[PDB]
Amino acid sequence: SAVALPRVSGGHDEHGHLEEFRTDPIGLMQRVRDELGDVGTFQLAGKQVVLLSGSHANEFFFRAGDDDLDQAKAYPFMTPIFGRRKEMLHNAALRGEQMKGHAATIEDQVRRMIADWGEAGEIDLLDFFAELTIYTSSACLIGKKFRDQLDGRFAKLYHELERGTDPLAYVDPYLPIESFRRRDEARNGLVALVADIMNGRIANPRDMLDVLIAVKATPRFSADEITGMFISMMFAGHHTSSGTASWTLIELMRHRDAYAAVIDELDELYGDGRSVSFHALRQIPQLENVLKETLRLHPPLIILMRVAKGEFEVQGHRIHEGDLVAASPAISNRIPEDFPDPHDFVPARYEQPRQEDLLNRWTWIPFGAGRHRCVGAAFAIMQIKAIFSVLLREYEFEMAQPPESYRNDHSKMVVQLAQPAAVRYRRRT
Numbered sequence: 001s002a003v004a005l006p007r008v009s010g011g012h013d014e015h016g017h018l019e020e021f022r023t024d025p026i027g028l029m030q031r032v033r034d035e036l037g038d039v040g041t042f043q044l045a046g047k048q049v050v051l052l053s054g055s056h057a058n059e060f061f062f063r064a065g066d067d068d069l070d071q072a073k074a075y076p077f078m079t080p081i082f083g084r085r086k087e088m089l090h091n092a093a094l095r096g097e098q099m100k101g102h103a104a105t106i107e108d109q110v111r112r113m114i115a116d117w118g119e120a121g122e123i124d125l126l127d128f129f130a131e132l133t134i135y136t137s138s139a140c141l142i143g144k145k146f147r148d149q150l151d152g153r154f155a156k157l158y159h160e161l162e163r164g165t166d167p168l169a170y171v172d173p174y175l176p177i178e179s180f181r182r183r184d185e186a187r188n189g190l191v192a193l194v195a196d197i198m199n200g201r202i203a204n205p206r207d208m209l210d211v212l213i214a215v216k217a218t219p220r221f222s223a224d225e226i227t228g229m230f231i232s233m234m235f236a237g238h239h240t241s242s243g244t245a246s247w248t249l250i251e252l253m254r255h256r257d258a259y260a261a262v263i264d265e266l267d268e269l270y271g272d273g274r275s276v277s278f279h280a281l282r283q284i285p286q287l288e289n290v291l292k293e294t295l296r297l298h299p300p301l302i303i304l305m306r307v308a309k310g311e312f313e314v315q316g317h318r319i320h321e322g323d324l325v326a327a328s329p330a331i332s333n334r335i336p337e338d339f340p341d342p343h344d345f346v347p348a349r350y351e352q353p354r355q356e357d358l359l360n361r362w363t364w365i366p367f368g369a370g371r372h373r374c375v376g377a378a379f380a381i382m383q384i385k386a387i388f389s390v391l392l393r394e395y396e397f398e399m400a401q402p403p404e405s406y407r408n409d410h411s412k413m414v415v416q417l418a419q420p421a422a423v424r425y426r427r428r429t
């Protein structure tokens, strides 16, 4: 009875386009736009995904309220991981008055991570930034006391947790596969770590954990419940910040002229004698523009999803209740009409005379837009500023593998930098 929306080619595997989505999601999404335009679809197992692109369609997507396009059940792969949410789990730590302190905390975490680097050596970006961001996230979003009781084990387990987000979750988040088994085992390991910390606290007597432990119903929360809360407080900001930091360093190393400009700027700026806690909250133009361009080319979330709660018409095409509706920062961020030479790294794109990020309000979307725009955006930008203010003034970096060999692993809904990502460092002098 109802007219079928345009469908992208391919998708003849068991679960439609799901197999291709797991192997090359960006290529799939780009083909949707190339073949069909601003509104096109692909099949994700038993669900149809209406992929929107372009300013007009994206505006509809981002301005829609939860009453029209619901985000609530659009990300099933998160249910097994976690086991009003922002107000309860994110807002407190993100208040403006807390930022100065967070910048100092982040600076401290970076110095601790590079304390044993010495004069020269080599690191792997995924291993370094994944661990560093576990410490900045836990210290800032949960507590310094809590972070001090964490070590490499927590980071290793958290990573396996993130790897348990295969697209098969859209079939069922509890299917019997290896990645989901490891996901549950990883979560169980985190619960054990938290339980140990709790017993240590109780053993010999205040942060967030101290408060949660004292809540009663007989203790109201188990280690599993507390662990779920902590996992949720750090998740949205961990893989995003980890990856963005890695790609920021990669692009600087790939474009030494920009790297040189950032170095000169940092040296001049800190010449006033103020701390990172002062400068990370204020303008650092060249670095900020490198970050904006890095986010445009390497958005950590390549697809955003919603579930339609009613019927809507976008450019003559009708979206029906129950349809999965999506927008893609990966595709939108590179629309050639909006971003001249979209595949090139051009930080000048954001300088005062151009401001391509502000002019393309509905297509420059690494942080999303509208009602669900990233609430941690300011924190994330401040964190990159604080991290590189320390790293780039203390050390010099060079690629230890071909520039084109650095890449992301897109096999899971949670994008992660692929290994190896070898980089050499040497103290500046």
Ligand code: HEM
Pocket: 071, 086, 090, 094, 236, 237, 238, 240, 241, 244, 295, 299, 300, 301, 304, 305, 365, 366, 367, 368, 369, 371, 372, 373, 374, 375, 376, 377, 379, 380, 381
């Ligand atoms: C530069 C790194 C980051 C990027 C690129 C980024 C990007 C995004 C995007 C695109 C969304 C929208 C998802 C959707 O529309 O369904 C989002 C949501 C969110 N982000 Fe981030 N984010 C980053 C860092 C962070 C950090 C560090 C935190 C924690 C302080 C955080 C917390 C959140 C939360 C709580 C939401 C949900 C917002 C809502 O649904 O109302 N993000 N982020």
Ligand SMILES: C[C@]12CC[C@@H]3c4ccc(O)cc4CC[C@H]3[C@@H]1C[C@@H](O)[C@@H]2O
Pocket: 088, 089, 208, 211, 212, 215, 229
């Ligand atoms: C209010 C709360 C207990 C306190 C928790 C709580 C307590 C202190 C803190 O710093 C953070 C949180 C986050 C979650 C809070 C729970 C939400 C509800 O499920 C429950 O009633």
Ligand SMILES: C[C@]12CC[C@@H]3c4ccc(O)cc4CC[C@H]3[C@@H]1C[C@@H](O)[C@@H]2O
Pocket: 075, 078, 232, 235, 236, 301, 302, 303, 304, 305, 413, 414, 415
């Ligand atoms: C659901 C989420 C927004 C979408 C994120 C999201 C969106 C797309 C994607 O491919 C991966 C992720 C990973 C993290 C997700 C966030 C966890 C919550 O803190 C927040 O509400």
